[PDB]
Ligand binder design. Structure first.
Ligand SMILES: C[C@@H]1O[C@H](O)[C@@H](O)[C@H](O)[C@@H]1O
Ligand SMILES: C[C@@H]1O[C@H](O)[C@@H](O)[C@H](O)[C@@H]1O
Ligand SMILES: C[C@@H]1O[C@H](O)[C@@H](O)[C@H](O)[C@@H]1O
Ligand SMILES: C[C@@H]1O[C@H](O)[C@@H](O)[C@H](O)[C@@H]1O
Ligand SMILES: C[C@@H]1O[C@H](O)[C@@H](O)[C@H](O)[C@@H]1O
Ligand SMILES: C[C@@H]1O[C@H](O)[C@@H](O)[C@H](O)[C@@H]1O
Ligand SMILES: C[C@@H]1O[C@H](O)[C@@H](O)[C@H](O)[C@@H]1O
Ligand SMILES: C[C@@H]1O[C@H](O)[C@@H](O)[C@H](O)[C@@H]1O
Ligand SMILES: C[C@@H]1O[C@H](O)[C@@H](O)[C@H](O)[C@@H]1O
Ligand SMILES: C[C@@H]1O[C@H](O)[C@@H](O)[C@H](O)[C@@H]1O
Ligand SMILES: C[C@@H]1O[C@H](O)[C@@H](O)[C@H](O)[C@@H]1O
Ligand SMILES: C[C@@H]1O[C@H](O)[C@@H](O)[C@H](O)[C@@H]1O
Lengths: 354, 354, 354, 354
């Protein structure tokens, strides 16, 4: 592969409502965001049906739950600015409609919830730097001015909280390596300088926390295999060496922590089916990749239900949304086969970065 | 000690608001519930001042955050029934005032949030059985009728979610041993039979989840030392043997999981000071107890701030509330000395069980 | 129990030959040491038959393999001095007969192999202090003079190597607590002062190393339950708190590390049957005790065969030696039932310490 | 690199004597084996001086300690047959001189000690299959006839015991992948079929056991980085996926388990200096490679001293043997700088496999 490739992304963004019902957000052929939700917080639930938000959008939507349980969606508009819309009350299907946050956006938006309850949004700006904007009070439609964190980005940003409440942001840099920058005090506008984690990545970075607190980062490497790196101390400075796992993947990875505390990674494999690998013991070795039947046309998007069961969403060859899930709350559970969440077809609205 | 002793309890109940500010609830000499909160979600924050809820109460208050971020407090009233009051909006100091849930209550109330967003309350009833009542919709003032789970209780109940979303309830039985009962499917009114975990306990049980998912239970034993037992499988049936730790304790324990994923336990020690022990490695051996300066007159109540720092509340010999906290987000952090949260004096309103 | 009780000991000492065949040493009704060995290094092997060493002895024999593979046995003689005899070549049943090491001995002897290949023997002397004597060259019948390490002993000593090659010795002191003393440099006559590990023990201490390097010590406590303590650092100074396991035991424990690296403990239980407990995960919680059919009249002595399978020796009610073993090299293996190693009856020749 | 490359090997074979003194074996410019030993079992000991064994050899020597403590060396002779010579007594510098074992050898010999005390030798034969021969009684100069295990080898074989006593042998196959074959019962001539572990390796395999029992295998991969794979069950069939570590290495790796039970790997790095990586926690992530000053001309050979301290041997640019070691028995110890073990120069006598 080209060292500047960005692997295929997931086709929807997912969130858990305040009652843990899953709700998915995607872009249809009308260039509008449509959403659909479980009617009860279990993977075998029926889904409500696809519902449209009026308005044309020009990026993949990002969704996050506010600290008062209301979902809020962020998306680039036809004016290349940032727009958002929110549930007006937790677990209710009444939304505010799109409202402006301005700026000039050249990536998909990324959203993170600070540990003091304030949402914060990260984007690549018109100068290819990292910019951000935040709620000035928890779960309130009152936002800061736009501010730059500098750098040069060549991927979408990925943000995650450290165990001590400090946001850390990861992104590919101008040298195609993974860089990162972090708050030096929790939920405060005081940030480090940019630092390189060195390698070469060919996907957006994917970040998860392990049970020990520590962040782990997953990405596709230059040889098209999964690689990963982890924090080895109590700060954002001390990291392991990179490790790669054998097996060519053809999409971004998606990572999840199962209810036994072990990590699992899902990715589209070299044969265009869904592949899965899991840690066999704590911090442990990784299993050989296992394959699920069925050709898929996007990266997976992963979520967990109220009972811990993992559920995976993909685009099918018919350009509709399919999903499968674990049959039991159990690391060795069998899985269902792909089922259709029918009613619309989806397009990949991800911002083209070059 | 007597095998039917119940060790001294904590003097306040604490919760984190939606923005993670700590808020404490206690009973003053007027037999009313008073509360106080941090003005910002950090341990060195100033506190707002003690504010009264009108109404006379006859138990320790229990508090839990709803899935929409609103705090809700439960307490026994002068009529021996259950009463509750709630924040009318997340992170706001406007409350509903006490509203009735009826029933007949002979213990302190215990509250648990189901993984489908519904609060559920557990109490000992007038027949000494375990009774419960629940929200019929997530974060809504719409409640079920009272229902019995049977048994015979001689302690307050303690409830916790398993990793798969099933509530499990622990309580001392008529033989002074620890018993438990559990949902057999997550957030459903389908329950097991009562089963004994065998020993003899002389405090209320204290339950926490470890990073591996598994529940761990802590209690004082018949020889006045801390003992503990843990789940060793993926279900509620398979448990370890009990282990005891040397050192006489003179209150209920309080347990917390620090931001490195290790467990710590706090208790009033044999010299009436606060003692602390921590796991030195994963699942590991426990440290010798360490002592903090200062005589204390209750069990500790423990909480974590937005930046991970642990904070401990106790009754002082002056009958006021004192607290101390970690200076840094770090397992080996030093601690502050006791500081006063002045303005009222507190009484122990715990229901007397015999 | 009395705080100065010493629990019942094992009836034989066992060693692995250079080819890993098990060989057992015990004292018969003629007050002579007799031995018997496997004919091949597997638990289902036939045994050779009981063979006598000429000479009357007055303690339990201790056996250790030299660094050149020759077994060597140590025992107190009718003159209260230390005697030894050795295989004249590895894996051969030709022995030297008893030869004198003099001194005055008031405990059973304890033997440890230094990491420079020299045997070293620890005993309580006529002044109740700890004394020792060592080979001055590896696997050579050339010994030092007797030297005192001081202290006051009220149990037999137990010695074990730390991971860095320093011998550490454990023994009950005059206050019935567990004390210890250690080499400050590996395989050198340079020793620490005595230090207390505090509790009260009612058996000889039993010491094993875990996979992490660290020593763990097991003993019966004042309430007749198993207790244990472990090193938590890289030196001999830093230890955990003591923990107890529920369940009354009526003999010394015996500990072994199974081939998955987890610890298992065997002891005679409160019903006079053999009980077993194992660590369920690394450093983990301990299982409930499991019982084997059959009344036993000594503590267990445990060993491992060439294929990893655990084998347990006990005195039966007929005063003969019985054993059972794992059917497969596997932590969850089933076990055989007791089988007789017939031909002599055994007596407990342990030195009476008070 | 070429997929059929075999990376540069270590220049000496090392063993611990019965008293744990290190002794090294290498080939000098006269094509004879010379050896040198520590005079005391500590890394700062003086060495005795280089001593010659008479006889011309045509492979790297392999050395193993017998179960009676006597070292024994194996080497290919001028007739392409296998020869051996042994210490006539443990810890003594009197040797038997070279004695014939016949056969026809096309690799370096590899030696393994069965858990019943019998040495067993593995070689590639004249038909490129794996052949072996064994002692028919423990630590005795009585050997079996040569027997074939089949296969097709394109590297030297590497043998290691599983925790249950079964020998397992690893070697590169005709497809440049790593293959293996194993005893199906401990120390018995009953073997599995050959099975592939799949990848492509460009060094001999290096095998070590972890504390959990399980084997781990390290090799250089097709992209010249270190890769590794581990057993994930209790048998020889169940393995993890392969993982690679970033960093180009230019020699075979050498692995050792330090006294805290963690693995460390040493290799010549891309800048021709010695590099080291270690596991930061159990099973854990690996550290970034650290470099030692000094250009080296072979792979490292690693050993541990009687006090646990790691010591590393390499060929220097002057064609002599150099070594360095840890200053303390401690995972975070500093290291010495290279010191010369002077008196002869060494050649790489490894059999050229293509
Ligand atoms: C998402 C928003 O939808 C509106 O209808 C458009 O007019 C805005 O430019 C923006 O794209
Ligand atoms: C997000 C920011 O919006 C502003 O309007 C621009 O001037 C910046 O370059 C950046 O794109
Ligand atoms: C993953 C899905 O598998 C199914 O069999 C197909 O019918 C869909 O188009 C989709 O590709
Ligand atoms: C908490 C409630 O306060 C009210 O004022 C009382 O009248 C009720 O009985 C109840 O105790
Ligand atoms: C909580 C329950 O309230 C009801 O009114 C009573 O009849 C029950 O015994 C129980 O006390
Ligand atoms: C824990 C507290 O320590 C302080 O020194 C005392 O003044 C208080 O009364 C309280 O007992
Ligand atoms: C073990 C030794 O056996 C000999 O026969 C005795 O004469 C010695 O005193 C000693 O007891
Ligand atoms: C083992 C030692 O033997 C010597 O002969 C005695 O004088 C000492 O007290 C001690 O008993
Ligand atoms: C442990 C053994 O169990 C057997 O059944 C008995 O016959 C023996 O006497 C011995 O007590
Ligand atoms: C190692 C042996 O040395 C002897 O001197 C030679 O004659 C043999 O062929 C063999 O090489
Ligand atoms: C080691 C074996 O030696 C024998 O003499 C040969 O016939 C075989 O091919 C093999 O090389
Ligand atoms: C590793 C060694 O480092 C030293 O500085 C050099 O003098 C030697 O030749 C050798 O290369």
């Amino acid at each position: 592969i080209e060292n500047s490739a960005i692997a295929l992304s997931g086709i929807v963004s997912v969130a858990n409502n305040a009652d843990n019902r899953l709700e998915v957000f995607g872009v249809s052929t009308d260039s509008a965001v449509w959403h659909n939700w479980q009617t009860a917080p279990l993977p075998n639930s029926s889904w409500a049906g696809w519902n449209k938000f009026n308005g044309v959008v020009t990026s993949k939507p990002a969704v996050h739950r506010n600290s008062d349980g209301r979902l809020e969606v962020f998306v680039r508009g036809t004016d290349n600015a940032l727009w958002h819309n929110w549930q007006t009350a937790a677990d209710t299907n009444t939304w505010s409609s799109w409202q402006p946050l301005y700026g000039g956006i050249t990536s998909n938006p990324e959203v993170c919830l600070n540990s003091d309850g304030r949402l914060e949004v990260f984007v690549r700006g018109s100068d290819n730097a990292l910019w951000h904007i935040w709620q000035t009070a928890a779960h309130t439609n009152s936002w800061s001015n736009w501010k730059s964190l500098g750098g040069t980005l060549t991927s979408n940003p990925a943000a995650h909280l450290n165990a001590d409440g400090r946001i850390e942001v990861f992104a590919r840099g101008a040298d195609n390596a993974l860089w990162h920058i972090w708050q030096t005090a929790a939920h405060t506008d005081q940030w480090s300088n940019w630092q390189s984690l060195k390698s070469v990545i060919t996907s957006d970075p994917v970040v998860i926390n392990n049970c020990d607190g520590r962040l782990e980062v997953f990405a596709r490497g230059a040889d098209s295999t999964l690689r990963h790196i982890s924090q080895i101390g109590s700060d954002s400075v001390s990291w392991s060496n990179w490790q790669c796992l054998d097996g060519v993947i053809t999409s971004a990875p998606a990572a999840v922590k199962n209810i036994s505390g072990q990590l699992e990674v899902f990715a589209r494999g070299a044969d265009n089916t869904l592949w899965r690998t899991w840690q066999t013991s704590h911090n442990g070795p990784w299993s050989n990749w296992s394959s699920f039947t069925g050709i898929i046309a996007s990266a997976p998007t992963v979520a967990k239900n109220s009972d811990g069961r993992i559920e995976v969403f993909v685009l099918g060859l018919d350009k509709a949304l399919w999903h499968l899930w674990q049959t039991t709350s159990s690391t060795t559970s069998s899985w269902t086969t792909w089922a259709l969440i029918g009613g619309i077809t989806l397009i990949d609205a991800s911002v083209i970065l070059e």
